[PDB]
């Protein structure tokens, strides 16, 4: 442990300058186009599933999972556990939920969730979501009262790609005016989803009544009336500059 942050010790990871050519060799191999191909008949076309076909399997390597803690020089904390499963679950948690909104900023936390995985500095909206789809990954963003989470579920061999896509949401998103305006639809859908779940809808009524017009009583979802006035790329960027940081 090289650094103690808020009661936990982390191993400090140093930044290193690596030529883009060298790193490209390590990126997982995949294709988007299959222009031709080499024909090969299914060799197991006549083998019933009850007959084993795989031989000379390498012996397994089992290790007891342990949670490890690390931190970058910019202050982003990294916690991972390896259960040796074949699917990974990457998650980015930011300490910026609805509780940190001022009354004039109502609904901005939900707005950030709505613009997730849109255009970034080095990728378009379409290219991000088609990459997630082609590689078989699922996920999304959820804004809570105390935090906002970005998550992806994927085959672990594609982790390098998934981590890049998640980080781009908070590193350099392009909150373009026309892309943001296309996200106004999600507000009505979010209300419908919430009200459908009677147990959750009653829970939100409890918190609004329990904490009258203050931190934990702020509405989770943005309204579709006067709130749309500041549902803008500029407003969202100002909110992110206040709360989104590598330290949080």
């Amino acid at each position: 442990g090289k650094s103690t942050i808020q009661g936990t010790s982390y191993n400090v990871v140093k930044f290193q300058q690596e030529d883009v050519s060298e790193v490209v060799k390590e990126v997982p191999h995949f294709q988007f186009y299959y222009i031709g191909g080499e024909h090969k008949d299914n060799k197991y076309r006549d083998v019933p599933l009850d007959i084993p076909v795989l031989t000379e399997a390498p012996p397994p390597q089992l290790k007891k999972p342990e949670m490890k803690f690390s931190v970058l020089e910019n202050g982003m904390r990294i916690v991972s556990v390896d259960k040796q499963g074949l699917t990974s679950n990457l998650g980015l948690f930011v300490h910026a939920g609805s509780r940190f909104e001022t009354p004039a900023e109502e609904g901005l936390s939900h707005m950030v969730e709505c613009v997730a995985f849109r255009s970034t500095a080095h990728l378009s909206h379409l290219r991000t979501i088609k990459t997630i789809e082609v590689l078989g990954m699922n996920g999304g963003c959820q804004a809570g009262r105390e935090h906002i989470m970005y998550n992806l579920e994927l085959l672990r061999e594609y982790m390098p790609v998934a981590s890049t896509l998640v980080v781009g949401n908070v590193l350099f998103p392009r909150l373009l005016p026309w892309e943001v305006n296309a996200c106004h639809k999600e507000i009505k859908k979010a209300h419908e989803r919430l009200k459908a779940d009677t147990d959750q809808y009653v829970s939100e009524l409890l918190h609004q009544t329990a904490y009258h017009n203050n931190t934990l009583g702020n509405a989770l979802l943005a309204n579709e009336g006067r709130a749309l006035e500041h549902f803008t790329g500029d407003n969202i960027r100002e909110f992110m500059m206040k709360h989104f940081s590598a330290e949080r």
């Binding site: 883009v20 790193v23 490209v24 390590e26 990126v27 995949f30 294709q31 988007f32 186009y33 299959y34 222009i35 031709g36 080095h122 990728l123 290219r127 990459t131 390098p160 790609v161 890049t164 980080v167």
Partner: protein, 84 residues
């Protein structure tokens, strides 16, 4: 991460070749229709050819003796010089 973006940018570099292949596969699936088109043409154009080409085109199955008992040119029923 720039390396990752390079790969994501470059995975569509060869769009023109991929779209050409797509259409080449649509054309491959349409080649079998020739099996019916060509014989239908020769079926409709059979009367246009000369008799020696009619015989060769049918491998000798058709010949002058196979013309109908009442040829559309009655003066040539049974042959170019008539029956007798």
């Amino acid at each position: 991460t720039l390396a990752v973006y390079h790969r994501l940018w470059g995975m569509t570099e060869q769009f023109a070749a991929r779209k050409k292949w797509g259409w080449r596969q649509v054309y491959h699936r349409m080649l079998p229709f020739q099996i019916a088109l060509y014989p239908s043409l020769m079926w409709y154009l059979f009367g246009w050819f000369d008799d020696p080409y009619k015989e060769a085109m049918t491998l000798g199955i058709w010949n002058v003796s196979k013309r109908s008992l009442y040829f559309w040119d009655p003066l040539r029923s049974g042959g170019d010089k008539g029956w007798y």
